[PDB]
Design a protein around this motif. Structure first.
Motif, mmCIF file in Angstrom:
data_model
loop_
_atom_site.group_PDB
_atom_site.id
_atom_site.type_symbol
_atom_site.label_atom_id
_atom_site.label_comp_id
_atom_site.label_asym_id
_atom_site.label_seq_id
_atom_site.Cartn_x
_atom_site.Cartn_y
_atom_site.Cartn_z
ATOM 1 N N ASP A 22 0.807 -1.221 0.000
ATOM 2 C CA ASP A 22 0.000 0.000 0.000
ATOM 3 C C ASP A 22 0.840 1.271 0.000
ATOM 4 O O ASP A 22 1.342 1.688 -1.048
ATOM 5 C CB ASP A 22 -0.977 0.020 1.181
ATOM 6 C CG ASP A 22 -2.030 -1.066 1.089
ATOM 7 O OD1 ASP A 22 -1.919 -1.929 0.194
ATOM 8 O OD2 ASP A 22 -2.971 -1.053 1.910
ATOM 9 N N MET A 72 12.907 -1.225 5.938
ATOM 10 C CA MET A 72 11.830 -0.897 6.862
ATOM 11 C C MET A 72 12.314 0.121 7.884
ATOM 12 O O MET A 72 13.407 0.681 7.772
ATOM 13 C CB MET A 72 11.293 -2.151 7.550
ATOM 14 C CG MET A 72 9.956 -2.599 7.014
ATOM 15 S SD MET A 72 8.644 -1.470 7.481
ATOM 16 C CE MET A 72 8.701 -1.659 9.261
ATOM 17 N N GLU A 73 11.474 0.360 8.886
ATOM 18 C CA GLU A 73 11.781 1.327 9.925
ATOM 19 C C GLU A 73 12.806 0.765 10.903
ATOM 20 O O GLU A 73 13.037 -0.444 10.981
ATOM 21 C CB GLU A 73 10.515 1.725 10.680
ATOM 22 C CG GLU A 73 9.407 2.267 9.800
ATOM 23 C CD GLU A 73 8.214 2.735 10.610
ATOM 24 O OE1 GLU A 73 8.238 2.574 11.848
ATOM 25 O OE2 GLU A 73 7.266 3.291 10.017
ATOM 26 N N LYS B 65 -5.552 -1.936 9.040
ATOM 27 C CA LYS B 65 -4.534 -1.290 8.228
ATOM 28 C C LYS B 65 -4.718 0.220 8.267
ATOM 29 O O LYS B 65 -5.832 0.723 8.435
ATOM 30 C CB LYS B 65 -4.576 -1.792 6.778
ATOM 31 C CG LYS B 65 -5.913 -1.595 6.082
ATOM 32 C CD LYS B 65 -5.855 -2.048 4.633
ATOM 33 C CE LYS B 65 -7.161 -1.756 3.912
ATOM 34 N NZ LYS B 65 -7.118 -2.179 2.486
ATOM 35 N N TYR B 66 -3.604 0.938 8.121
ATOM 36 C CA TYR B 66 -3.634 2.382 7.888
ATOM 37 C C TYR B 66 -3.651 2.623 6.379
ATOM 38 O O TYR B 66 -2.654 3.001 5.760
ATOM 39 C CB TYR B 66 -2.438 3.061 8.542
ATOM 40 C CG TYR B 66 -2.256 2.761 10.009
ATOM 41 C CD1 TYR B 66 -2.992 3.440 10.973
ATOM 42 C CD2 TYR B 66 -1.329 1.814 10.433
ATOM 43 C CE1 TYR B 66 -2.822 3.174 12.321
ATOM 44 C CE2 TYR B 66 -1.149 1.542 11.777
ATOM 45 C CZ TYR B 66 -1.899 2.225 12.716
ATOM 46 O OH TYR B 66 -1.727 1.959 14.054
HETATM 47 C C1 LIG Z 1 2.613 -1.243 11.218
HETATM 48 C C2 LIG Z 1 2.298 -0.826 9.809
HETATM 49 C C3 LIG Z 1 1.886 -1.826 8.983
HETATM 50 C C4 LIG Z 1 1.494 -1.863 7.578
HETATM 51 C C5 LIG Z 1 0.532 -1.109 7.037
HETATM 52 C C6 LIG Z 1 0.087 -1.088 5.618
HETATM 53 C C7 LIG Z 1 -0.045 -2.502 5.051
HETATM 54 C C8 LIG Z 1 -1.250 -0.318 5.530
HETATM 55 O O1 LIG Z 1 -1.782 -0.031 6.614
HETATM 56 O O2 LIG Z 1 -1.683 -0.046 4.397
HETATM 57 C C9 LIG Z 1 2.438 0.658 9.477
HETATM 58 C C10 LIG Z 1 2.923 1.591 10.594
HETATM 59 N N1 LIG Z 1 3.017 2.864 9.908
HETATM 60 C C11 LIG Z 1 3.743 2.567 8.675
HETATM 61 C C12 LIG Z 1 3.505 3.632 7.589
HETATM 62 O O3 LIG Z 1 2.501 4.358 7.725
HETATM 63 O O4 LIG Z 1 4.335 3.684 6.656
HETATM 64 C C13 LIG Z 1 3.299 1.149 8.252
HETATM 65 C C14 LIG Z 1 4.471 0.290 7.785
HETATM 66 C C15 LIG Z 1 5.654 0.191 8.757
HETATM 67 O O5 LIG Z 1 5.549 -0.601 9.717
HETATM 68 O O6 LIG Z 1 6.643 0.903 8.496
#
Ligand SMILES: C/C(=C/C=C/[C@@H](C)C(=O)O)[C@H]1CN[C@H](C(=O)O)[C@H]1CC(=O)O
Lengths: 159, 146, 146, 84
Positions: A22, A72-73, B65-66
């Protein structure tokens, strides 16, 4: 050469990588115009549906199974280096990012994020809560083996 | 103003299945409600209970999911859709700053500062043994030499 | 250890011909392996390309670079007439709080401390190269002003 | 007894000298073979040692400026960085 940053991955395109789906900074890397990261976004958008993972752990097990690169982070990497000693972190904190909680307008904790949670930061509570959640030859030897066997043969012929 | 009505109101906590130190506690009794999870967001919610004291519904979500907007949809799905379709009209969610989350989330000071790095396995890099006999050249030329 | 084996041979001494052939063959394998290692090390040394132009600086993110902020240089770089200067301004904006200085001598000492490439005026390049011999310029004139 | 040691260190010295000369010749020949003969401008994109460019502004300038193939756009970047 061994990998030191994503510039080495731009040089060495033999080992591929992946990221979370995403909006996990692909659109940020789409908007970023750094030339190495332009190449990174170009290769991972050519491999958008080809080589990509959906969850955090799915990419983690890919590095656990095969020689996979995983961008990743720092929080997840810092957690899994304590989990497994077989994993390493490559590079540094390139892309500045803030993980934070949104607020309502006029909520009493809106400024107390900037005061009372800042008082947790000044007393240092925010980092040892993180700490309490996670603590943060060869060919020459073969040549010697062959030479020793030939030496044993030469001694046993010689007498 | 709705300041006279916003006081003494229940607060809705809508988070996802977070980092692996933020999960359900391991017990035979399904401790739910405010004890549904234990983690750093739970510690921050304990801090907010020392700050606010409002009732918090620490519960899971139907999407997990975000999500962001799509080119064929245009609607920011996921937890952003949760915070705009009146499940919690006040945008309260722990996430990262994006290009669009500046304007679709009311937002505050970010508590956590982090970078983006590369995760890779540590290789052994050792191939010991008699490998002058095991060159990339074929052993057909070796038995030819013999 | 090989000379210890040769001393063992000298202690215990058709068989002479095969032990001479074995010793000569082992010697030439050791010499050839050293020769291949030296050839690889000399090849990778001569294949090194030191950074000379701004095109060399654009494709590399290992060596940090920048100029004095609000000193009209990134004003030129944000025009982005060439995509190389667009990448320069993009790396400057992405590392706004990282590799930006406020003084010429502040940008000088960052080069003397760590690996840094300071973008500054070419006439003052003549002054700092007449004074200090540890510093130099690379490339020519990126943009001509007066 | 000393003549065997003299011959051994002389063979060692000549072998090291010959191996170093061979490695230097191999590195120089590898650099020269990497510097391929130039054809079809993809060697011009790699070899920045031999400088080049168009004549001046005009039809050759605008064709390379508007090119989105990113080989000729890289050509325009190289010839516009050093256009004076
Ligand atoms: C924990 C996490 C999981 C994955 C999210 C995606 C699949 C989504 O919510 O569309 C988030 C946390 N905030 C990140 C971001 O907004 O980029 C995202 C990915 C991450 O962990 O870096």
């Amino acid at each position: 050469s061994p990998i030191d940053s994503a510039d080495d991955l731009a040089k060495q395109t033999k080992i591929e990588y992946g990221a979370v789906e995403d909006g996990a900074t692909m659109t940020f890397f789409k908007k970023s115009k750094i030339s190495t990261y332009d190449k990174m976004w170009a290769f991972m958008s050519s491999r958008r549906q080809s080589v990509l993972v959906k969850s955090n752990e799915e990419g983690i097990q890919r590095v656990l199974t095969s020689d996979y690169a995983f961008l990743m982070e720092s929080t997840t990497i810092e957690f899994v280096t304590q989990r497994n000693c077989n994993l390493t972190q490559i590079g540094g904190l390139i892309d500045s990012k803030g993980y934070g909680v949104g607020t309502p307008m006029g909520s009493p904790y809106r400024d107390k994020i900037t005061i009372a949670i800042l008082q947790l930061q000044e007393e240092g509570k925010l980092h040892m809560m993180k700490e309490k959640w996670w603590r943060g030859v060869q060919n020459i030897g073969g040549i010697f083996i062959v030479l020793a066997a030939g030496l044993v043969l030469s001694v046993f012929v010689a007498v | 103003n709705i300041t006279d009505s916003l006081s003494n109101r229940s607060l809705i906590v809508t988070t996802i299945l977070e980092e692996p130190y933020v999960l359900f506690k391991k017990s035979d009794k399904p401790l739910y409600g405010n004890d549904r999870f234990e983690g750093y967001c739970i510690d921050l919610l304990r801090e907010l209970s020392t700050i606010l004291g409002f009732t918090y519904e620490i519960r899971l979500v139907e999407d997990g999911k975000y999500g962001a907007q799509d080119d064929v949809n245009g609607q920011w799905n996921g937890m952003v859709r949760e915070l705009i379709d009146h499940k919690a009209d006040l945008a309260v969610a722990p996430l990262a700053i994006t290009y669009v989350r500046e304007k679709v989330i009311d937002f505050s000071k970010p508590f956590m500062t982090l970078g983006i790095s590369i995760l890779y396995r540590k290789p052994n890099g050792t191939n010991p043994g008699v490998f002058s006999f095991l060159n990339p050249l074929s052993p057909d030329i070796w038995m030819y030499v013999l | 250890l090989a000379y210890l084996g040769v001393s063992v041979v000298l202690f215990v001494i058709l068989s002479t011909r095969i032990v001479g052939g074995i010793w000569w063959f082992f010697t030439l394998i050791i010499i050839s392996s050293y020769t291949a290692n030296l050839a690889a090390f000399l090849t990778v040394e001569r294949m090194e390309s030191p950074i000379d132009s701004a095109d060399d600086l654009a494709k590399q993110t290992k060596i940090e670079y920048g100029a004095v902020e609000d000193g009209a240089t990134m004003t030129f770089f944000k025009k982005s007439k060439i995509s190389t200067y667009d990448k320069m301004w993009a790396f400057m904006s992405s590392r706004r709080q990282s590799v930006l200085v406020k003084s010429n001598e502040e940008g000088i000492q960052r080069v003397l401390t760590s690996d840094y490439a300071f973008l500054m005026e070419s006439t003052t390049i003549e002054f700092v190269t007449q004074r200090n011999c540890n510093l130099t310029q690379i490339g020519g004139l990126i943009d001509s002003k007066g």
